[PDB]
Amino acid sequence: HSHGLFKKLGIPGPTPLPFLGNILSYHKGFCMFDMECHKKYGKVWGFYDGQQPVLAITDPDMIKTVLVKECYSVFTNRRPFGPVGFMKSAISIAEDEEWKRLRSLLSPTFTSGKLKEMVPIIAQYGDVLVRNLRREAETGKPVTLKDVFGAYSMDVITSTSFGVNIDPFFLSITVFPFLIPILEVLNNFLRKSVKDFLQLMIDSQNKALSDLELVAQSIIFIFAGYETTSSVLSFIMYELATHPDVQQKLQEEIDAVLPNKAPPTYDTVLQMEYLDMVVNETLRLFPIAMRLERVCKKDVEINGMFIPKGVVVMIPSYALHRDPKYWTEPEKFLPERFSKKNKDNIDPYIYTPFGSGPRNCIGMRFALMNMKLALIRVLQNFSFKPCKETQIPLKLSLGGLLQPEKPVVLKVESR
Amino acid sequence: HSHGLFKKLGIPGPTPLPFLGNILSYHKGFCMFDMECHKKYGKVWGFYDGQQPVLAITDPDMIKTVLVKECYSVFTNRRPFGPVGFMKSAISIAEDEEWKRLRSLLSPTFTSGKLKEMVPIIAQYGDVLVRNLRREAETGKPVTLKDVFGAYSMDVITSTSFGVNIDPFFLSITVFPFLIPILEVLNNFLRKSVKDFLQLMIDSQNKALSDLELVAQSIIFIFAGYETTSSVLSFIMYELATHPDVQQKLQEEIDAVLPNKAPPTYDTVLQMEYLDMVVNETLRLFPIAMRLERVCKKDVEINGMFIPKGVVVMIPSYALHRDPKYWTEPEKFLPERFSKKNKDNIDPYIYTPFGSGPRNCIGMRFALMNMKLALIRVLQNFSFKPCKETQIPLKLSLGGLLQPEKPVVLKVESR
Ligand code: HEM
Ligand code: HEM
Ligand SMILES: CC(C)(C)OC(=O)N[C@H](CS[C@@H](Cc1ccccc1)C(=O)NCCCc1cccnc1)Cc1ccccc1
Ligand SMILES: CC(C)(C)OC(=O)N[C@H](CS[C@@H](Cc1ccccc1)C(=O)NCCCc1cccnc1)Cc1ccccc1
């Protein structure tokens, strides 16, 4: 009863089936579906997540309009996600004025000054990461990176935020979004554990912040602080192993900036350009968000195109990061794309690993620093080679979230 | 999990039961529940329609703030009603900017000029109403008013709007509002019959109006144009029968303005003050809307009182129309309250039979004229006396909508 929206507007796209819409095309993942649609319809197309119309845009100006120019006015909130419960007060989930309050309350936590305070604290768990790698390296045995990276990722998020130091169904959500309010009325490790980030959240309480709403942000920061950091670091070391010349050229820069295995400081990390080039190129190949979404809260006509209320505007970050119309040989791992000689030829609204506009990743600078502090301390001590069980080429998880199919396993040799 | 909102805010009210909230108190109707709550907690109280918090206000300034001062900004929409289907595009149901468009598109239909055009058309069915009453009067037999009034009400709405001339479950809606989106995906006499009001709706099409959205307004105008007119006219004739002095004093004014049973014109109706006093007093005793509601779309602090987002602000029109703190002997039918000697002592935010602010009854002036044109032609020919089966005193429908329990039946005598 709503599958004729894009047909009325003259917007191309795949023909939706009743109830299901176009979800059956997700059998190859969100990424392959966006790449195929981008090659079939061009700059703009639409589809249906069940009965929910989703409009996809690939025009950099139109992307700037949604993410930056018309953020506070029209494209303020993402697709409604539930059931969440008390997590509705989370900044990544809150909407409209409730989000505007949380954004300002939590913004001063990721400043250039607050990050510099965490470098002396993070430098501890970097050495634990090396010494935990030193054990599984002297013993000739392939290492699951996401395990030793996830242990480092959780050790950082619990101390930077609080100070603690320690060593299948969403498919029906899109088909049955009417069942989301159902589960809300159908209804703890942290609801009392909360009873630094945690400091400022009470120091931005001295229009203040609640407590159940303080826990919700802490849980959110623990999610993204754990899974995103470990998953990207795994993606990086796979590329460094499958491209040994890049791994060595990176090791040469680390030793030049940090001789005698110097401790990586805040200022020494921002000086390494080839390290940032490797991180940015890996994030181009593997944008863990895959997609950026905004809900059209009222009828608009952006860049000469009518968009009706309720439509979910989507930006296919993965499909744009691998578009041959912007990247030469887009499947190859080439960090020289982000060299200061070639960095100018990159549209910031085509390359969006952290989003754009007022609602981008608030912890972008923290995530870049955390991963760079991890790579520096690890590559200072070890080199990485592919193993017999190393999945080459690496398959992406055909499911929902952006992960490798088989875990990344490489050989570790101590320098 | 949300029954502590008014307890946190220090707002009094009845203690809600889990899931049900306070709906069990509706066993005496919305009206008796509001009257008892108004006497128990005073100016402001709160309750829960299941899990939905509803705040009741009785302060005229605070009522003016919600209905008039902060309408476009905060209190723009009513309680979400569903499942409606295509009727979501109806002006009484539409929200935010969609309603603002429909209001302006349909406003010029109820001007003082458009009503004057319908007086020569309505005057036809007034004589049919008399001649249909003349048959059941020469035959000594009590008449069900709502039947002969409903036949007149439908004959007017179909010709004024188009030109055609022809002679149990909502309880679960409040407990299970999560089931409303369910029924929406679960899914005609007028969807093709539409294929004057109907004129202007296409003449306000020559940012225009749709067609399925044109039918939705036509159906809405047929609802209120049928049930409201007949129900109030029944309430009026009961009061005129149970107060024969008022019925005669009204008959004297009608014959003075319209001698020799003159045809009631637009200008002759607005001259009769005692007729308007009878209509206004009946609407005080019987405000068919009972309640006025606005959804708080964002946190506000109106008249020194914090109100959170999502709360349904409610104005108990019935309870305020019978408040002894504003009306002396509020249960008695006394049209002299609206005399030009005493009309000044009436707060327009306490007496709201048609609402107030930008979202009041758009067909207020049409309804007043339609009923007055009906009373004039009927009282010119007949007098009304109570019968053996006349329910004296009249009981109100203890259920949902404001109706009499037993239908109003009176004796009719031709003058
Ligand atoms: C490699 C690491 C990360 C990447 C690539 C990444 C990427 C993203 C992207 C693409 C968005 C959406 C931007 C948009 O919608 O325009 C986002 C949102 C967000 N990210 Fe991250 N993220 C990373 C790590 C983190 C970390 C460590 C945190 C720590 C708190 C974090 C917190 C958030 C929050 C709170 C939001 C929602 C902000 C809002 O809705 O206002 N992310 N991230
Ligand atoms: C005795 C007769 C009537 C009474 C007492 C009455 C009363 C009311 C009241 C109290 C409201 C809500 C006002 C508010 O929320 O502030 C309303 C709304 C409305 N009424 Fe009536 N009404 C009557 C007859 C009619 C008629 C004949 C029409 C013909 C079209 C009509 C059309 C509407 C509409 C469309 C709305 C919603 C307006 C909007 O939401 O913008 N009503 N009425
Ligand atoms: C992706 C899309 C649009 C198709 O549907 C959605 O699932 N919507 C996302 C909401 S799920 C929720 C995760 C969660 C909450 C409670 C318990 C378990 C799990 C969340 O709010 N997590 C935000 C974490 C911050 C983050 C994550 C990744 C990278 N950097 C930062 C909203 C969303 C989507 C994409 C990026 C960010 C946020
Ligand atoms: C009352 C409350 C707040 C507790 O819940 C609601 O049921 N909400 C009302 C929505 S029901 C709908 C009626 C209908 C639609 C399709 C098919 C069958 C029935 C409607 O939109 N009818 C508006 C008709 C205009 C009118 C009616 C009466 C007097 N004058 C004008 C919204 C509402 C409430 C009170 C007054 C006006 C509108």
The angle at the Cα of B35, spanning B30 to B38, to the nearest 5 degrees, equals 120
- Regarding the beta carbon of A93 and ligand 3, being less than 6 Å apart is answered yes
- d(CA B100, CA B94) in angstroms, rounded, equals 9
Burial of A323-352, coded b for 16+ CB within 10 Å and e otherwise, reads beebbeeeeebbbebbeeeeeeeeeebbbb
A66 burial (CB, 10 Å; 0-12 / 13-18 / 19+) is buried
Minimal Cα–Cα distance from A11 to chain B, Å? 20
Residue B255 Cβ contacting ligand 4 at under 6 Å: no
User: Is any Cβ of chain B less than 8 angstroms from the Cβ of A395?
Assistant: no
What's the length of chain A?
415
Pairs across A and B, CB distance < 8 A: 30
Ligand 4 atom 25: residue of nearest CA: B224
CA distance A306 to A77: 19
Burial state string for B343-379 with b = 16 or more CB within 10 A and e = fewer than 16: eeeeeebbbbbbbbbebebbbebbbbbbbbbbbbbbb
Give residue for tokens 């007017």: B156
Q: How was this structure determined?
A: X-ray
Instruction: Find the residue in B nearest to A85 (Cα).
Output: B1
In whole angstroms, what is the distance from residue B224 CA to residue B355 CA?
14
Q: Give the minimum alpha-carbon distance from A103 to chain B in angstroms, rounded to a whole number.
A: 17
| Ligand 1 atom, smallest distance to A317 CA | 10
Residue B338 CA to residue B272 CA, distance in Å, equals: 13
Give B 153-182 residues with CB within 8 A of chain A. Answer: 177-179, 181-182
The candidate with the shortest Cα–Cα distance to A109, out of A230, A221, A224, is A221
What is the rounded CA–CA span in Å between residue A175 and residue A168? 13
Q: Is B88 in the pocket of ligand 4 (CB under 6 A)?
A: no
Residues 6+ apart with CB under 8 A from A217: A90, A91, A102, A106, A201
Report the SS3 class of residue B411: strand
Does A361 carry a binding-site annotation? yes
Q: Is A207 on the interface with B (CB under 8 A)?
A: no
User: Which one-letter DSSP state was computed for residue A17?
Assistant: B
At A296 the three-state DSSP class reads: coil
Residues from chain B contacting residue A182 (CB–CB below 8 Å)? 178-179, 182
* Residue A251 DSSP SS3: helix
**Run of H or E residues at B114:** helix B112-138
Q: Is B323 in the pocket of ligand 4 (CB under 6 A)?
A: no
Mapped onto helix, strand or coil, the DSSP state of residue B97 is helix
Helix (H/G/I), strand (E/B), else coil: B385:
strand
From the CA of A411, how far away is ligand 2's center (Å)?
A: 76
Query: Phi/psi of residue B78, each to 5°?
Result: -90, -175
Q: Do A299 and B97 touch (CB under 8 A)?
A: yes
CA-based Rg of chain B, rounded to a whole angstrom?
22
Residue with structure tokens 């085509």? A350
Instruction: Specify the 3-state DSSP secondary structure of B300.
Output: strand
Instruction: Calculate the alpha carbon distances from A80 to A92, A181, A353, B35, B162 in Å.
Output: 11, 11, 22, 39, 42
On whether any CB of chain B is under 8 Å from the CB of A97, the answer is yes
Q: Is B191 on the interface with A (CB under 8 A)?
A: no
Instruction: Give me the residue label for tokens 């940015």.
Output: A280
Q: Which residue of A has its CA nearest to B183?
A: A178
State if residue B87 touches ligand 4 by the CB under 6 angstroms criterion. Answer: yes
Contact B11, B55 (CB under 8 A): yes
Question: Is some CB atom of chain A closer than 8 A to the CB atom of B20?
Answer: no
Q: Cβ of A185 and B178 within 8 Å?
A: yes
Q: What are the chain B neighbours of A185 within 8 Å (beta carbons)?
A: 19, 51, 178
Q: Which of A1, A5, A178 to mutate to test the interface with B (most CBs of B within 10 A)?
A: A178
DSSP one-letter string for B8-50: HTT---PPPBTTTBTGGGGGGHHHHHHHHHHHHH-SEEEEEET
Question: How many CA atoms lie less than 13 Å away from A187 in the CB half-sphere?
Answer: 4
A185 → closest Cβ in B51, B299, B309? B51
Instruction: Tell whether A187 is within 8 A of chain B (Cβ).
Output: yes
User: Where in the sequence is the domain holding A340, given as residue range(s)?
Assistant: 1-415
Q: How far is B16 from chain A (nearest CA, A)?
A: 16
Burial class (CB in 10 A: 0-12, 13-18, 19+), A395: exposed
What's the token pair of residue B160? 């004024």
Contact (CB, 8 A) for A301 and A38: no
Atom 41 (ligand 1) nearest CA: A359
Report the gap between the CA of A298 and the closest CA in chain B (Å): 8
Spatial contact of A282 and A271, defined as CB atoms under 8 Å apart = no
The angstrom resolution of this structure is 2.7
Six-digit token string for B170: 């909502």
Q: How many domains does chain B contain in total? A: 1
Cβ contact A179–B182 (<8 Å):
yes
Ligand 3 pocket member A361 (CB < 6 A):
yes
